[PDB]
Structures are given as structure tokens and as C-alpha cells.
Amino acid sequence: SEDELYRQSLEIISRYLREQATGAKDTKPMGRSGATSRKALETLRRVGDGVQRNHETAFQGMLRKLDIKNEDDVKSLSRVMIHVFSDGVTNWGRIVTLISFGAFVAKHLKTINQESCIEPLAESITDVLVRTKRDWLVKQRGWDGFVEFFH
Ligand SMILES: CCc1sc2ncnc(O[C@H](Cc3ccccc3)C(=O)O)c2c1-c1cc(N2CCN(C)CC2)c(O)c(Cl)c1C
């Protein structure tokens, strides 16, 4: 508890991944900073959908390599995301790439009837994001900066 950046990040990443996998928009209400989370989510729908479409084949090739079939395969993904994601280059571009690839994997977990792994995948992406990029994100004003960068 007492970590708004983490809680907001999970709300937004979790909601994007569920709605990308199922095509249904979450109606359950947003917590503190609702206005910023809704706008964050709206921006992911536009920018994250763009990355998935623009780079479908790069995304498909990686999903094919990672050979995700189950809960264990999702747990191995975290360490891959750390190696690729935490390497000293931080920008909203690569952050959207991370979250877009997550939604792409989430869609695949729906298609293979492994939708019980989507909430853990979201947690693992959130943990990689906030654990490894905390000071950059606070400098960029967190999700308010995200929305302002892409509006
Ligand atoms: C777990 C998969 C993930 S998490 C994540 N998070 C942020 N950015 C990523 O990648 C972009 C490039 C990028 C790739 C595809 C589309 C847009 C940008 C980047 O690192 O700066 C990735 C990738 C990622 C990384 C790669 N690589 C890995 C090895 N490097 C040397 C070459 C690019 C890749 O081919 C693909 Cl398809 C992805 C999805």
C-alpha cells in the first residue's frame, strides 16, 4: 500500500490488457486520479493499437520465439522483459512498446483459453515498468506526462 504510481500503473495496464484480449471495456470505477487513468487508457487504445498494427509481424515473430502455452511461459516472459526493457534507454516510445507487446500476448492467451494468466502478465509488466523505471517516471510526471506527451 502507499504507492500511487504502482497502483495507477496496474489499473491502467491491467484494464488495457483485459479489454485488448476480450474486446469489452471495464466499467468498474477508477480509483484516485480517475481523470488521468481514463485519459491514459484512451491514449493506450490509440497509441498501443497503432504499435500492434504497425509492427504485427515483428510482434508475431517474438510471440512465436517465446512459445507461450501456459502460466510457466508467462513467468519466464518477465525475465525476458527485464533484460530487453531495463538497459538504460527510457522513453514513452519503448514503454508503449512494452505495454503493446503485453496486449498482443494477452490476445494470444485469450485465443489459447489461458485467460487466467492475463492478470499475472499485467502485474509482471507493471512490476517491470515501475520497479526498473521509478525515478524516470516520477521525473516525467508519471501518467499525466504520458497523456501530455502523446495528446
Ligand atoms: C519482450 C519483447 C519486447 S518487450 C519490449 N519493450 C520495449 N521495447 C521493445 O522493443 C523495442 C523495439 C521494437 C520492437 C518491435 C516494435 C517496436 C519496437 C526496443 O527494444 O526498443 C520490447 C520488446 C521487443 C524487442 C525486440 N528486440 C529485442 C532485441 N533487440 C536487440 C532488438 C529488438 C523485438 O524484436 C520485439 Cl518484436 C519486441 C516486441
Curated annotation (Swiss-Prot):
<feature type="short sequence motif" description="BH3">
    <location>
        <begin position="40"/>
        <end position="54"/>
    </location>
</feature>
<feature type="cross-link" description="Glycyl lysine isopeptide (Lys-Gly) (interchain with G-Cter in ubiquitin)">
    <location>
        <position position="25"/>
    </location>
</feature>
<feature type="short sequence motif" description="BH2">
    <location>
        <begin position="135"/>
        <end position="150"/>
    </location>
</feature>
<feature type="short sequence motif" description="BH1">
    <location>
        <begin position="83"/>
        <end position="103"/>
    </location>
</feature>
<comment type="similarity">
    <text>Belongs to the Bcl-2 family.</text>
</comment>
<feature type="cross-link" description="Glycyl lysine isopeptide (Lys-Gly) (interchain with G-Cter in ubiquitin)">
    <location>
        <position position="28"/>
    </location>
</feature>
<comment type="subunit">
    <text>Interacts with HIF3A (via C-terminus domain). Interacts with BAD, BOK, BIK and BMF. Interacts with PMAIP1. Interacts with BBC3. Isoform 1 interacts with BAX, BAK1 and TPT1. Heterodimer of isoform 1 and isoform 2. Homodimers of isoform 1 or isoform 2 are not detected. Isoform 2 does not interact with pro-apoptotic BCL2-related proteins. Interacts with RTL10/BOP. Interacts with BCL2L11; may sequester BCL2L11 to prevent its pro-apoptotic activity. Interacts with GIMAP5 and HSPA8/HSC70; the interaction between HSPA8 and MCL1 is impaired in the absence of GIMAP5.</text>
</comment>
<comment type="function">
    <text>Involved in the regulation of apoptosis versus cell survival, and in the maintenance of viability but not of proliferation. Mediates its effects by interactions with a number of other regulators of apoptosis. Isoform 1 inhibits apoptosis. Isoform 2 promotes apoptosis.</text>
</comment>
<protein>
    <recommendedName>
        <fullName>Induced myeloid leukemia cell differentiation protein Mcl-1</fullName>
    </recommendedName>
</protein>
